[PDB]
Amino acid sequence: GPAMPPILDVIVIGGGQAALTTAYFLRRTSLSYLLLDEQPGPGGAWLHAWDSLRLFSPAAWSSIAGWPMPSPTEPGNPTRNDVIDYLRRYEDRYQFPIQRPVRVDTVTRLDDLWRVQAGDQQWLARAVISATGTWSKPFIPPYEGRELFQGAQIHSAHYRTPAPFAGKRVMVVGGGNSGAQVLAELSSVSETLWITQEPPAFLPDEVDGRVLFERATARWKAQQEGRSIDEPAGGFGDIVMVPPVREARERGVLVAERPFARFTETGVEWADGRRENLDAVIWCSGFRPALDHLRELGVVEADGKVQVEDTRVVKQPNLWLVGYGDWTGMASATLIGVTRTARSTADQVVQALTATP
Ligand SMILES: Cc1cc2nc3c(=O)[nH]c(=O)nc-3n(C[C@H](O)[C@H](O)[C@H](O)COP(=O)(O)OP(=O)(O)OC[C@H]3O[C@@H](n4cnc5c(N)ncnc54)[C@H](O)[C@@H]3O)c2cc1C
């Protein structure tokens, strides 16, 4: 049968939801393409989510393009394992060209093509779409004295179960949905403190993450009609009152302080005299984009982000970034929201590559 094409039209780097949704749209084109994903099997970063994690909206509101997420038969929003299974079944449905396990090291512009390199294995492509997520680049803010702290430090990226924290005094740093959920779970076994940059904001009890998607969509539509609305703010990471978080609220757990000033050997200290000893800190302080494979090109800013117009990289030809965060399209880092930019990305790749008869 035919060899792999010496030049692929498109390489997609990654194999999670964003890559798959991009693959869905590429399948209605005539372009040759290939997905390269570093893990042994399907599931993207959901493989690394903590054991109890569930989505903040129902299945219907957590679907990527095409085949929708099966409704769970047990009560509650889809679990981590539900998402993994969804993605696994979605790949089985469409038989996308995916190679695993392939860790892309770099991307090199050579002659007017992209050379994509994973160790020994290299491919050439006319276009490269990066959809590598964020989980592999946990971010911790640069607080003084962290190196001195003698208790446990872990990022949420590495959290799985609350067991080893039981009976301890634990600080959760970071708001949003992740902070609130991790805090809620830790508080069931440990004495907790929550640190957030701003006072946390909660959605009403009767609503779900579809509200956050609406807000996102309203923002991009305004960014694109008569563009305005600084007031009110987006509240784009207001907290959804998922069951464990609603239970935490009843126990008085959802109260936060503003950031401390430094770490000591035994805990933290604020500029105003607050001083708190801690056995462990769980950093729910977010992530940077997983763009190490673009560093040699020089496009990754001090931010860790890259200058883009929607998903198109500004400084370089025929490169797109899909699904990383609002900075690559409002709501693009969610199951429901990635579709809009995966779709428009595929159209832009077509526009760049299709040739007259
Ligand atoms: C704790 C948590 C809770 C969340 N809750 C929700 C929710 O309730 N609802 C919702 O819609 N979204 C939620 N999200 C957000 C978003 O949907 C997830 O972050 C999701 O994993 C993003 O999918 P992605 O495809 O962009 O990235 P990923 O799932 O990270 O997929 C990227 C894939 O590319 C691979 N890869 C990375 N670098 C390379 C490389 N160099 N070469 C080859 N492969 C590479 C990765 O290993 C991975 O398999 C949550 C995220 C987190 C962290």
Author numbering: -2 to 354
Sentences reproduced from the published study:
The structures of CFMO and PSFMO revealed the context of the phosphate binding loop in each case, and also clarified the structure of the mobile helix–loop–helix motif that appears to shield the FAD-binding pocket from bulk solvent in this class of FMOs, a feature that was absent from the structure of SMFMO. In order to shed light on the nature of the cofactor binding loops in CFMO and PSFMO, the structures of each in complex with the flavin FAD were determined to resolutions of 2.39 Å and 1.83 Å, respectively.
Analysis of a dimer pair by PISA revealed an interfacial area of 955 Å2, with six H-bonds and 8 salt bridges formed between the monomers. The monomer of PSFMO superposed with the structure of the SMFMO with an r.m.s.d. of 0.90 Å over 327 Cα atoms. FAD was again clearly visible in the omit map after building and refinement of the protein atoms, and was also modelled and refined successfully in the oxidised form, the density revealing no puckering of the tricyclic ring system that might be indicative of the reduced flavin. The nucleotide binding site of PSFMO featured a glycerol molecule, from the cryoprotectant, occupying approximately the same position as the adenine ring of NADPH in mFMO, and with the hydroxyl groups forming hydrogen bonds with the side chain of Tyr140, the backbone NH of Gln194 and a water molecule. Superimposition of the putative phosphate binding sites of SMFMO and PSFMO revealed that the backbone Cα atoms of residues thought to be responsible for cofactor promiscuity in SMFMO, Gln193 and His194, are in the same position as those in PSFMO, Gln194 and Glu195.
